C-alpha cells in the first residue's frame, strides 16, 4: 500500500490534520495505512477510523440518493427518454461506494475483529461491520441482497449481545449501536415495530442509569439518547 513507508504515528498525526482540514478521503487513507500496520487500535484511533469512513461514505450515499431520485423520475410515465447517462453515472457512484464499503469490511476482517477482545473494541468493530453491510444493502438490488441484509443483521446482533452483557446501558458505544440497529430495522429490514421497540427500550434503560454518571459521562450519553428520541418522534 501507498502508506507502507510511513510511520504509524505519522499516519495518525496526519489523520488528525486531515480531519481539521475536512479532508476525509485523505483521513481515511491515513487510517487505512495505520490499521495495516497490524497493531491493535486505541479508543481514539478507532474514533478516527470511524469518523473518516463515515464522512467519505456519507457523501457517497447522499450523491447516490440524488442520482437514484433522478433515475426514478426518468422511469415514470411521460418522462422523455434521455439515454443511458443517468443510470451510468448512478452506477459509477454506486461502484465507488461499494468499493469503500468493501475496503472497510476488509480492514475489519483482516484483522481488527479477530484481535479485539475487550467489549468496547469488539462491539465498536461489529457495529461498523453492521453499518457497512447496511450501506451495501441500501444499494443492493440483486441475488445477494438477502445475504447482505443478513450479514448486517448478524454483525449488529453479535454486537448487541456483547453490549448487553458487558457494558452499562448508558455506554455511548452501546447506545450508538442500538441507534443504528434500530435504523437498520426501520429502513432495511422492513421491521418498523422492532425499530421503535428497540429505540424506546434503549432510551428507557439508559434514562434509569444516568444517576450513576459524572457530568461529563451524562453529557455523552444524553446526546445519543436525544438521537433515539428524535428517531422515535420521526417514526410515531
Amino acid at each position: 500500500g501507498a502508506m507502507g513507508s510511513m510511520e504509524r504515528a505519522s499516519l495518525i498525526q496526519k489523520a488528525k490534520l486531515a480531519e481539521q482540514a475536512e479532508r476525509y478521503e485523505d483521513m481515511a487513507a491515513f487510517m487505512k495505512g495505520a490499521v495495516e500496520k497490524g497493531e491493535e487500535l486505541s479508543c481514539e484511533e478507532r474514533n478516527l477510523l470511524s469518523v473518516a469512513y463515515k464522512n467519505v461514505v456519507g457523501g457517497q450515499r447522499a450523491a447516490w440518493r440524488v442520482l437514484s431520485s433522478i433515475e426514478q423520475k426518468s422511469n415514470e410515465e411521460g418522462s422523455e427518454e434521455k439515454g443511458p447517462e443517468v443510470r451510468e453515472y448512478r452506477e459509477k457512484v454506486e461502484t465507488e461506494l461499494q468499493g469503500v464499503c468493501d475496503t472497510v469490511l476488509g480492514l475489519l476482517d483482516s484483522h481488527l475483529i479477530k484481535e479485539a477482545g475487550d467489549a468496547e473494541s469488539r462491539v465498536f468493530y461489529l457495529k461498523m461491520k453492521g453499518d457497512y453491510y447496511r450501506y451495501l444493502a441500501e444499494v443492493a438490488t440483486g441475488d445477494d441482497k438477502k445475504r447482505i441484509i443478513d450479514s448486517a443483521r448478524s454483525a449488529y446482533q453479535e454486537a448487541m449481545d456483547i453490549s448487553k452483557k458487558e457494558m452499562p446501558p448508558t455506554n455511548p458505544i452501546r447506545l450508538g449501536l442500538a441507534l443504528n440497529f434500530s435504523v437498520f430495522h426501520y429502513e432495511i429490514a422492513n421491521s418498523p415495530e422492532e425499530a421503535i421497540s428497540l429505540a424506546k427500550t434503549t432510551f428507557d434503560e439508559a434514562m434509569a442509569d444516568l444517576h450513576t454518571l459524572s457530568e461529563d459521562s451524562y453529557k455523552d450519553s444524553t446526546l445519543i439518547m436525544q438521537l433515539l428520541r428524535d428517531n422515535l418522534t420521526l417514526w410515531t
Binding site: 441507534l179 443504528n180 435504523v183 426501520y186 428517531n231
Partner: peptide, 5 residues
C-alpha cells in the same frame, strides 16, 4: 433520513 452515528 433518521439519525445514525
Amino acid at each position: 433520513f433518521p439519525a445514525t452515528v
